[PDB]
Subunit: 530 residues, 2 copies
């Protein structure tokens, strides 16, 4: 019994529990749409820009915990998505990008939007920022390739995949071979027992242990065993800026965020070296996460690091025990072994109004810009994984679009995006797609009339010698929401903001809130990095 | 022995190449570059709303400039956004220089903020397949030589884009003043052999039914005058490729229109009938849309001549009898010398008509990708050389939307109009804010048919409408979108509101947008042809 090669790929994608595919169609990429629409199990989402779809697939992935899928046509369709694929690459999230190719009969001829080595070579443009980038050579090889793709995206440190599909093979017949995921993909690695008992032994003798939880806690879905491990051990837990959300910040053992725009209940504990035992679980230990690799973060006795990627272990700090394993399989073993022992408006208040009204289960997406300083510092996130910030690449526009995918992945939970205005101008057009698909998301535009943080570097680094930051005319984001069919609120006092915010969440449809913000307000954590 | 920072010397040499703007968005590590431009007071920076628009602006400026276009973007996502614009510069053979930041060397491999090395997001290797050169500045001293290498590479041979990556720490290291005029580090252009020019001369002399196919290469060589003098001196008719529309006056007696996609029956019949004996191809790559999917009937009976500055294009899809590797302007000047010395809603079809009946003769017309290509290429008549700007090499949606702003910065005292689809404007539509900011009078004509016109036509004409991925449930309102960005706008539901709107647009000398309601089921010209 046969199917068309591209028909078998969606059926294999169905088996991975992929529910939506975001993208923009094209001549050579239509065979895929006729296939997704033949099955009616997976649904296609038409976006306004291919980076917006990629950003959505990434957003769907991180909250879904499943594989994100986006599609694009030959050439510029594909190149458009790149920045989103580059963010999925730096945040360790499994995104599969499907791109079309011209038929082999036109290779080297100057085909329309040719994406081979002879034209715009997608597979090598996309290699440095994917776990795998490959053109399917034959129809017959579609099953084994797409299982190769799904296996690579969600094993090890997860990441994005680029699959290039020549339009001609897309409808060649092939045998129907669809497998459940666990038949062609392995499980995760656990720590050796020798290391589990050595750090158990280091915790038992510690005068001041501390845990630094990074983004790996979310990819490992390790919140519960982290919460049980901290509670059982009594060790205080700090998050990276990107790892905020991975431990409840209301909890007695919570020190908040360590690093950029962080809290100094974390700074002192972790930086004023009383610390002797440091357990780093699922963090790159990059710039922001370490306060520019401050040598004072190193503990006096032992540094322990758990990470599913061996190459990150001991990269910037010498480790005493380096565990190459899943954070969730490591922690349950650790608990198993220790219980076995038995012995305008000021942004500060716009976050303030948000904390007083967003439901407990609100997923908060934050963009890149001064909104990260406000988001990481002043919002307290109590629900596991409910704080969504893309600090891997820190691309402006990320959450503006990301969030749409997040609410498709968690439709019964409220989803809110806190974004800057220049970021909204880069990807704000995708509120039209939420409008078209009736995806109720609330964007909170922190409108300071330009590039907030760049304005501050000018003043504080090149003594107001020039201005490349401010606008001469602020954008009108409520008129813009109106053009895109989205209900809108303007707020220039705190209480207009609160009225807007509780109207939006009642609203059952997309909504945008345009907040007046002074471009000179110095965000938390910006004067320390200067 | 005057010393200056490397980034000042980069700017100073760019000044020598006549670049007048740098399009981009600032960032932490890229701020030294902006500090340099503002202290020098010559080149001016344009802050755009997306870096892809900045690269679109630089491509448009270069194409109208005849000079080098420059954009800048920061580490990581800054540069990746610009990719599609650089890939467009690469497929249309436009000299664009994209300057991108790199974190300081002391943070390589450490996980620095938006690290764009081999250890992070590899800018130099991402940009390698769609640039003539992509290289990270290794040291401060090599800024002079690497910047002179980029200008020579971008504007020599077949022109194309360049990627220069600059580590943020070496930007501010002092280097010796070392600035040269453009003709001390780049060569001139190649001419044909005397042997081949007289061999082509002697073929046209004996040709019964010769024909010329003029492609985009005529604009890159700045060869319009001698192409018209070559056709006039020889009496042989001129057809263009769809992308070369503005290279041969269509109001001339010898003009054949466009041959290929959405072309004219005049051009197809002469070149495909089977009565041509000598065909000269000047500057076209002879790809799909340039040759009706490589119809073998384009082969001439006697001799095919191909002229092209890139040798690897000669005879690629059709066998040539004379293959000249030379610049098109120097070839045409030699052939003329050697023969003279010899001595012996609204229907879009009526929207562009309203446009041609009203727009000045010197208007530079930008067209985006979508049905506007069928309407622009087929129904618009272009009489001015280079006055039609369409990026058909990559055919990236949204290209004309932003590029026209760069075009009008390059030709400030000529009218510039962009004819774009509604989905195209939705991806890069927000750049009009940049035009409102800098007071750049461009007129956008949005053919708003409420979704993806040609894809909807594919559904009907290849999937029998088994599905709809093409129309939006709610047409976007582009006059409200214009208004919120500070741009004057007009809506048109009649043909006359369009004529009133367009005539208002041109008088105002400010940015303006005209939102035209169009039926999405209208079959554009040349779309019937392309279905099989
Ligand atoms: C795609 C992309 N292109 C450029 C940047 C660089 N970049 C910022 C970085 O974080 C570092 C802060 C110095 C560089 S920040 C910021 C202004 C945001 O302006 P807005 O959106 O309005 O936010 P705000 O006004 O609240 O500051 C910009 C442009 C980026 N990150 N991504
Ligand atoms: C960046 C980018 N992403 C996708 C495409 C594919 N694509 C077109 C190509 O040429 C081929 C013709 C079918 C594929 S065309 C068109 C819609 C026009 O929508 P509009 O702007 O409204 O134009 P129109 O209404 O007249 O059809 C689209 C989406 C593209 N080119 N670039
Ligand atoms: N399932 C997992 N278990 C443990 N660690 C993981 C897992 N998945 C990813 N990681 C690790 O988490 C780290 C996340 O680092 P990054 O994405 O830079 O976050 P942060 O900046 O918060 O440290 C990476 O080093 C990655 O190898
Ligand atoms: N200065 C020049 N003189 C002559 N030909 C050129 C010059 N610059 C570029 N070309 C050629 O013009 C061609 C442009 O092709 P393309 O971009 O596909 O336009 P079209 O579709 O009209 O062929 C390329 O083959 C290139 O080698
Ligand atoms: Mg702002
Ligand atoms: Mg349209």
């Amino acid at each position: 019994k046969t199917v068309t090669a591209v028909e078998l790929l969606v059926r294999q994608m169905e088996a991975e529990g992929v529910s939506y595919v975001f993208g923009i169609p094209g001549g050579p990429l239509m065979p895929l749409y006729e296939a997704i629409f033949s099955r009616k199990k997976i649904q296609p989402i038409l976006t306004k820009h291919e980076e917006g779809a990629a950003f959505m697939a990434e957003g769907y992935a991180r909250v879904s915990g499943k594989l994100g899928v986006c599609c694009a046509t030959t050439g510029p369709g594909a190149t458009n998505a790149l920045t989103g694929i580059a963010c999925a690459y730096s945040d360790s999230t499994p995104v599969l990008l499907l791109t079309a190719q011209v038929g082999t009969a036109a290779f080297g001829k100057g085909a329309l939007q040719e994406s081979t080595v002879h034209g715009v070579d997608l597979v090598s443009i996309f290699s440095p920022i994917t776990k795998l980038s490959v053109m399917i050579p034959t129809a017959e090889k579609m099953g084994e390739m797409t299982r190769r793709a799904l296996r690579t995206a969600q094993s090890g440190r997860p990441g994005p995949i680029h699959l290039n599909i020549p339009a001609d093979i897309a409808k060649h017949p092939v045998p129907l071979e669809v497998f459940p995921p666990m038949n062609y993909r392995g499980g995760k690695p656990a720590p050796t027992i020798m290391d589990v008992v050595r750090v158990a032994e280091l915790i038992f003798h510690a005068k001041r242990p501390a845990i630094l939880a990074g983004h790996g806690i979310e990819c490992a879905k390790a919140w519960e065993e982290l919460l049980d491990f901290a509670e059982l051990t009594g060790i205080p837990v700090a998050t990276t800026p990107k790892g905020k959300s991975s431990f409840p910040e209301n909890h007695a053992l919570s020190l908040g965020v360590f690093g950029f725009a962080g809290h100094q209940k974390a700074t002192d504990y972790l930086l004023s070296g009383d610390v002797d035992v440091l357990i780093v679980i699922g963090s790159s230990l990059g710039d922001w996460q370490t306060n520019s690799w401050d040598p004072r973060l190193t503990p006096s006795v032992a540094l322990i690091q758990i990470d599913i990627d061996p190459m990150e272990i001991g990269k910037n700090y010498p480790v005493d025990v380096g565990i190459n394993a899943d954070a969730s399989e490591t922690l349950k073993a650790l608990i198993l072994c220790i219980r076995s022992s038995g012995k305008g408006i000021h942004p500060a208040m716009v976050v303030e109004a948000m904390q007083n009204r967003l439901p407990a289960d609100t997923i908060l997406f934050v963009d890149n810009g001064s909104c990260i300083n406000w988001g990481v510092h002043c919002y307290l996130a109590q629900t596991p994984g409910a704080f969504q910030i893309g600090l891997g690449l820190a691309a402006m526009g990320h959450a503006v679009a990301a969030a749409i995918g997040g609410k498709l992945a968690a439709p019964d939970r409220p989803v809110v995006a806190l974004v800057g205005d220049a970021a909204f101008a880069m990807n704000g057009m995708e509120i039209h797609t939420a409008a078209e698909y009736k995806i109720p998301v609330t964007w909170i535009v922190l409108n300071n009339g330009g590039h907030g943080l760049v304005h501050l570097f000018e003043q504080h680094q090149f003594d107001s010698k020039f201005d490349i930051s401010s606008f001469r005319k602020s954008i009108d984001f409520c008129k813009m929401a109106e053009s895109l069919g989205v209900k809108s609120y303007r707020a220039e006092t705190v209480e207009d903001f609160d009225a807007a915010l509780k109207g939006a969440l009642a609203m059952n449809t997309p909504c945008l809130i345009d907040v007046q913000v002074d471009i000179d307000v110095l965000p938390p954590g910006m004067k320390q990095r200067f």
